[PDB]
Design a protein around this ligand. Structure first.
Ligand SMILES: Nc1nc2ncc(COP(=O)(O)O)nc2c(=O)[nH]1
Length: 274
């Protein structure tokens, strides 16, 4: 039972991050093909961003961006997750060939998401993000115990999914590192990863390039490490997550995490025989 490496393809970021004017399906498809060639088991396709100050787009535009990419990658037999909070977008992505729904709201953004998943009978990833104030969706709340509360709320989301008719075997949970959480919250959640794995629900970890790695690796004068300088740290997290029973890791740099997991595998089996 090896850890699943989930490589990220965001069609909007691929098309626009370096200044491009037009949506570029072919670039995103070639990106996904390259991540598969580098060892990804799952390609997570997204059309939106949730970070502060992102460009905001209609769900119709979100779907129009992801579905051509999903259609071409699915035609190559690739396993594809759709990274969306919007039920209508998830449904369109499933029509296009996605086989997993990755919901950073954990079903809380769209009351129709549970019904989409219950009907489609595909896996549903429920990420933890406590976001009571839509005017401040990233504000860090007061946790008495972030470890216990994340677990409680993820399992409550699992319960609501099952009540809606999703089969328990099809749920995945994700602690949502960095989403209304401090760096210290993240490290407590990661140290407690075995506890969350012990729920029996598959656990996905997404640490790749997140702000707490910029903080961890800050320069002597306080300047955080830029996102490109966070990849060694991200790959080490993939290894420690794998060692502690994570079902999957969500990463941008698939090659670096695959390299790291090959080291873990070669070390572990180094004295085996026969
Ligand atoms: N399940 C899951 N999905 C996610 N989707 C987007 C982002 C935002 O980060 P990005 O812009 O680097 O993709 N992070 C996660 C995460 O940690 N877990």
């Amino acid at each position: 039972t090896p850890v699943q490496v989930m490589g990220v393809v965001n069609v909007t970021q691929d098309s626009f991050s370096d200044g491009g004017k037009f949506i570029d399906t072919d670039r995103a498809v070639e990106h996904g093909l390259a991540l598969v060639a580098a060892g990804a088991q799952i390609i997570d396709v997204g059309g939106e961003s949730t970070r502060p100050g992102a460009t905001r787009i209609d769900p119709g535009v979100e779907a129009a961006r992801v579905t051509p990419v999903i259609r071409e990658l699915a035609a190559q037999g690739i396993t594809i997750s759709i990274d969306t909070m919007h039920a209508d977008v998830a449904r369109a992505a499933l029509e296009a060939g996605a086989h997993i729904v990755n919901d950073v709201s954990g079903g809380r953004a769209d009351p129709g998401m549970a019904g989409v998943l219950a009907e489609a009978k595909v896996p549903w990833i429920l990420m933890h993000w406590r976001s009571v104030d839509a005017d401040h969706p990233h504000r860090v709340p007061g946790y008495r115990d972030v470890v216990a509360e994340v677990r409680t709320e993820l399992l409550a989301a699992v319960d609501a999914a099952v009540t809606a008719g999703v089969e328990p075997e099809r749920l995945v949970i994700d602690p949502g590192l960095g989403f209304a959480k401090t760096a210290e919250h993240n490290w407590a959640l990661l140290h407690a990863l075995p506890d969350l794995v012990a729920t029996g629900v598959p656990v996905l970890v997404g640490a790749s390039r997140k702000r707490f790695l910029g903080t961890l690796l800050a320069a002597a004068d306080g300047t955080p490490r830029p996102p490109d300088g966070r990849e060694t740290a991200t790959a080490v997290i993939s290894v420690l997550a794998a060692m502690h029973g994570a079902w999957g890791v969500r990463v941008h740099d698939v090659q670096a995490s695959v390299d790291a997991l090959k080291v873990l595998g070669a070390w572990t089996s180094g004295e085996q025989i026969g």
